C-alpha cells in the first residue's frame, strides 16, 4: 500500500529464468513488482547519502575592501609600485592619469598610477566533493500484504529498509512471512560523483557539475585554505573606476548570492544541513525473487461474509483499491476475489494484491486490483451473502498503450541507455537496444551538451527541415528521426 | 536638485509566516486567509493525494502555499525636472600667474 | 447525498469605502493602502493634470 497514491508508480511484471529482474529505482518514483508465483512488492529509493565530503573550492559571493592605497609616477618614469602588490590579500590595478605642473610633476603626460585594496570575504559557498565509495542508498521494500503495520508499536512489522553501499551492493531483505528478497544493486553507475560537487551556499545546497563549478567567475580558495587571504580571482568581485584620468578607485561588486541563485537554474537542490542527503537520481538493481514465496498459500477459501469498510476507490494508475473486512469462521483464509463480468462468465481483471488472505477476523484487508476498461464487477466472497461490486473504468486500451509509450519514452529521456534496464529480463534484443542507445547517446550528449531547451527545439526544427528537403531517402529518414527526437528531448528536457 | 522618487525596487527580501492549505482531488482549490493580503506571496499547485494522506480519492489534490514577503534593501530610483539642474562652470583666463 | 461545495459565485455585490489617489504626471503611480488587501477592487488610470 506504500506504493499506491504515488503518480510516478511503475509496474514491473515478470522475472526471467533465475527469478531475477532488472529495475531502476528513482527517488520520486516507486516500483511495484509483479511475478507469477511471487507476491507483489513495492520498491522505493527513499534516500541517498554522501558521507565525508571534502571541499575542493570555497568561492566568495560577498567581499569588502578596507585598506586602499595609491602610488603615482610621472610620465616616462615607468609604472609605479606599491609594496602591497606582492600581497595576495590585496587586489591591485595599474592605470594612467594626466600629469603636469598642476600635479607637481613637471612633464605633462600620462603618469602611470597603481591602486590597491585589501580583499576580505564576508560570505562564501563551499564546493564539497564526495568519493563515489561513500554513497549510501536507502531502499524500502514493502509487500502487498493487504494489511497495515498496526498502531500498537510493541510489535513493528512491514517496514524493511535496506541500505546499499558501493562496497556492499548485494543485500537481502527478510520480509516476514514472504521469505527473503535479494537486491543486487550497482551504485557505482547511478551517478558519477567524480564529476559532481555538493555546492552549499547559506543553508541551501545544490548538486552541480564539477567543470561548471570550477568555471565559476567568482574568487575562490583552494579548499584546504584555512585563513582566506589568498583569493584567486579577486578581480571578478571588484571594479576599478578611472573616470576621465583624474583618479583611480576600486569598489566591491555587492553580494553575488542572487546572481548565484540565477546561475544555479537547472541544478537539482539537495540537503546538506544534517548530512548530505540527495533526494534525486536513480539506482539500478537486480531483484532476486527466487527465495520469495507467497504467504498463506496453504490456506482455504473463507466461505464467509465480507463487508466493505473502505469504499472502492480508483488510483491514478487505472487500478482499484478496496478495503474489506471478514465476518465469518476460519480466520486464516484466502479471500475469494474475482473481477468478472455482469453474468460472471469471464474473468476480466487481474488483482494486484496477489493472494489476499485474512489473518485475523477483526482485521480489515485492503485489496488492489486492475479492472478492465469499461464495465466490470468486483466479486468478494462466496454464494451466501457474496458482495458484488460494480465499477466502470473510463479509459481506453489505445489510450493506455499511448500512455505507456509516452512513459517509456520519458524514462529513456531521463535514464538514457539505463531505461533498457528498468524491467529487462536479460535477452538479446534488450542488449542490442541498450548498446545502440549507448552509442547514439554518446554522440547526442557530445553534440548537445550545454544547450538550453530553446536551442534544442531550434536545432531539432532545423534538422527536421533539412531531412525533409533531402533528395536521398536514406538520409531524409535518418535526419527526420534525429530532428523529431531532438524536438521531443527539447520539449521534455528541463526538469 | 529636489529629485522625486519614481519607484523603489526590492533587491533583498525575506519570507516568513509560511502556511499551506490542501484539498482533496476534484474538490476545487484550497483557501488561505493570507491570500487576501498582498504582503503574502502565494502559489497554487497540485500534490498527490490518496488514502495515505487522508483523502478518499486518488487524484491530484490542489495545494496553496503562502509566505509573507518583507523587503530588506531598496534600489530607489529618483527623477529630476530639468529646471532644478544647476550647472557649474569655472572660467580661468590665461593670466600667466605662477600657480 | 452529502455533496461537497466546489465553488461560490457572486451574482449580487456592492461597493463601499471608495477611495482614490492621484500622482502628478511623470512621477509614477498613485499608492493606496486599500490596494494592500484583495477585498478592495482597484484599477489604475490616467487623468490629465
Amino acid at each position, epitope marked *: 500500500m506504500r506504493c499506491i497514491g504515488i503518480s510516478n508508480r511503475d509496474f514491473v511484471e515478470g522475472v526471467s529464468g533465475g527469478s531475477w529482474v532488472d529495475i531502476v529505482l528513482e527517488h520520486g518514483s516507486c516500483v511495484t513488482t509483479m511475478a507469477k508465483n511471487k507476491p507483489t512488492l513495492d520498491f522505493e529509493l527513499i*534516500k541517498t547519502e554522501a558521507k565525508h565530503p571534502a571541499t575542493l573550492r570555497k568561492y566568495c559571493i560577498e567581499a569588502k575592501l578596507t585598506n586602499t592605497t595609491t602610488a603615482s609616477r610621472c610620465p616616462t618614469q615607468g609604472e609605479p609600485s606599491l609594496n602591497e602588490e606582492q600581497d595576495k590579500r590585496f587586489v591591485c590595478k595599474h592605470s594612467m592619469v594626466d600629469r603636469g605642473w598642476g600635479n607637481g610633476c613637471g612633464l605633462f603626460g600620462k603618469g602611470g598610477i597603481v591602486t590597491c585594496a585589501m580583499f576580505t570575504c564576508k560570505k562564501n559557498m563551499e564546493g564539497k566533493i564526495v568519493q563515489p565509495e561513500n554513497l549510501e542508498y536507502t531502499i524500502v521494500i514493502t509487500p502487498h500484504s493487504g494489511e497495515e503495520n498496526a498502531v500498537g*508499536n510493541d510489535t513493528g512489522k512491514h517496514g524493511k529498509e535496506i541500505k546499499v553501499t558501493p562496497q556492499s551492493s548485494i543485500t537481502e531483505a527478510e520480509l516476514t512471512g514472504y521469505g527473503t528478497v535479494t537486491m543486487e544493486c550497482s551504485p557505482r553507475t547511478g551517478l558519477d560523483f567524480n564529476e559532481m560537487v555538493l555546492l552549499q551556499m547559506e543553508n541551501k545546497a545544490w548538486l552541480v557539475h564539477r567543470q561548471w563549478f570550477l568555471d565559476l567567475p567568482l574568487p575562490w580558495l583552494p579548499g584546504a585554505d584555512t585563513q582566506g587571504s589568498n583569493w584567486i580571482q579577486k578581480e571578478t568581485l571588484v571594479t576599478f573606476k578611472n573616470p576621465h584620468a583624474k583618479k583611480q578607485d576600486v569598489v566591491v561588486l555587492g553580494s553575488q548570492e542572487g546572481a548565484m541563485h540565477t546561475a544555479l537554474t537547472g541544478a537539482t537542490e539537495i540537503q546538506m544541513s544534517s548530512g548530505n542527503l540527495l533526494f534525486t537520481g536513480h539506482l539500478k538493481c537486480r531483484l532476486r525473487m527466487d527465495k520469495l514465496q507467497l504467504k498463506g498459500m496453504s490456506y482455504s477459501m473463507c466461505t464467509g461474509k465480507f463487508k466493505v469498510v473502505k469504499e472502492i476507490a480508483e488510483t491514478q494508475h487505472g487500478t482499484i483499491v478496496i478495503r474489506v473486512q471478514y465476518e465469518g469462521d476460519g480466520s486464516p483464509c484466502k479471500i475469494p476475489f474475482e473481477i468478472m463480468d455482469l453474468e460472471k462468465r469471464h474473468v476480466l481483471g487481474r488483482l494486484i494484491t496477489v493472494n489476499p488472505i485474512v489473518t485475523e477476523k477483526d482485521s480489515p484487508v485492503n485489496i488492489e486490483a486492475e479492472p478492465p476498461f469499461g464495465d466490470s464487477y468486483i466479486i468478494i466472497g462466496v454464494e451466501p451473502g457474496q458482495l458484488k461490486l460494480s465499477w466502470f473504468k473510463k479509459g481506453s486500451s489505445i489510450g493506455q498503450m499511448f500512455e505507456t509509450t509516452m512513459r517509456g519514452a520519458k524514462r529513456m529521456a531521463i535514464l538514457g541507455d539505463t531505461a533498457w534496464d528498468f524491467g529487462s529480463l536479460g535477452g538479446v534484443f534488450t542488449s542490442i537496444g541498450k548498446a545502440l542507445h549507448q552509442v547514439f547517446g554518446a554522440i547526442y550528449g557530445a553534440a548537445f551538451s550545454g544547450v538550453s531547451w530553446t536551442m534544442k527545439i531550434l536545432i531539432g526544427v532545423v534538422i527536421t527541415w533539412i531531412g525533409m528537403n533531402s533528395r536521398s531517402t536514406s538520409l531524409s529518414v535518418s535526419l527526420v528521426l534525429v530532428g523529431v527526437v531532438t524536438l521531443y528531448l527539447g520539449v521534455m528536457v528541463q526538469a | 536638485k529636489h529629485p522625486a522618487t519614481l519607484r523603489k525596487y526590492c533587491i533583498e527580501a525575506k519570507l516568513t509566516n509560511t502556511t499551506t492549505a*490542501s484539498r*482533496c482531488p476534484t474538490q476545487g482549490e484550497p483557501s488561505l486567509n493570507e491570500e487576501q493580503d498582498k504582503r503574502f506571496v502565494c502559489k497554487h499547485s497540485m500534490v498527490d493525494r490518496g488514502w495515505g494522506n*487522508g483523502c*478518499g480519492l486518488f487524484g491530484k489534490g490542489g495545494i496553496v502555499t503562502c509566505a509573507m514577503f518583507t523587503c530588506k534593501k531598496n534600489m530607489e530610483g529618483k527623477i529630476v525636472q530639468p529646471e532644478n539642474l544647476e550647472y557649474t562652470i569655472v572660467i580661468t583666463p590665461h593670466s600667466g600667474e605662477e600657480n | 447525498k452529502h455533496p461537497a461545495t466546489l465553488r461560490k459565485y457572486c451574482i449580487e455585490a456592492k461597493l463601499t469605502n471608495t477611495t482614490t489617489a492621484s500622482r502628478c504626471p511623470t512621477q509614477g503611480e498613485p499608492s493606496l493602502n486599500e490596494e494592500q488587501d484583495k477585498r478592495f477592487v482597484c484599477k489604475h488610470s490616467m487623468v490629465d493634470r
Partner: antibody
Amino acid sequence: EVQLVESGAEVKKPGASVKVSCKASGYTFTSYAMHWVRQAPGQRLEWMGWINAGNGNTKYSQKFQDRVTITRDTSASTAYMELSSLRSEDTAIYYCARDKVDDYGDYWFPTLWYFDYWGQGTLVTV
Amino acid sequence: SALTQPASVSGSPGQSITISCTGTSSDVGGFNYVSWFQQHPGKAPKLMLYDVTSRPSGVSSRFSGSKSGNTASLTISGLQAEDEADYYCSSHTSRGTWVFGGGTKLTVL
C-alpha cells in the same frame, strides 16, 4: 516499548512562564514529530502545535502562536513546550503526542494514526 | 472551529450507543483524518479509532467508526462498564492544524 514521559507538575503565578518537557524513548526520536495538547481541568482537549524533531520545524495554533515556543533536544530525545506570560486560563494538563514524519524528514502530512502514543500529562497551575 | 459533540451520552450495558462529531468541510467533512480518543479520568487520551474507522491494534473490535458528509460517528456495541469514559473527536484540518471535539461523557447506567 515506546513510552513518552513528561516533567512533573508545577505551580506558577500569573504573568510567569512555564517550560514542560516530554522525554521520548523506545523509538527513533528524530523520526517523529512531537505535538503538544493541553486540557483544562474538566474540559476539552486543545491542540497547541508540533515540533519536527528531524529538523526543528514547528507549527503552532493561531491561538498560542505568540506565547508558545516548542523546542527539541536531539541528544536527549526530549521535547520542550515553553508557554510565556501565563494567565489564569492556562492551568491545565499539557500532553505530548507523537506522529511519524515521512521518509524525506518533512512533516506536513500526518499519519492516519496520529497521537497514537501520549505522555502521561503535565499539570500546570497559575 | 472545535468539532461539535454531544455534551453527554448514556447507554444501558450490553447495548449499542453512537456519538456524533459534526465539523466543517475542512476538518471532518473534507478529509479522512478523523480520530476518536478515549480518556479515562486522570489518564492521557487513548487512540480508539483513526482514519474514521480503523482501530488501533489493542483497541477492541466493539468500536466502530463512520463518517457521513461533515459528520463522523463512533459506535460502541458491548457497552461494558470499562467503556464508560470521555470520548474526544479530532481531525487534521485543511490548514494543517488539529481540532478536537468538545468530548462526550459516556455513562452505562
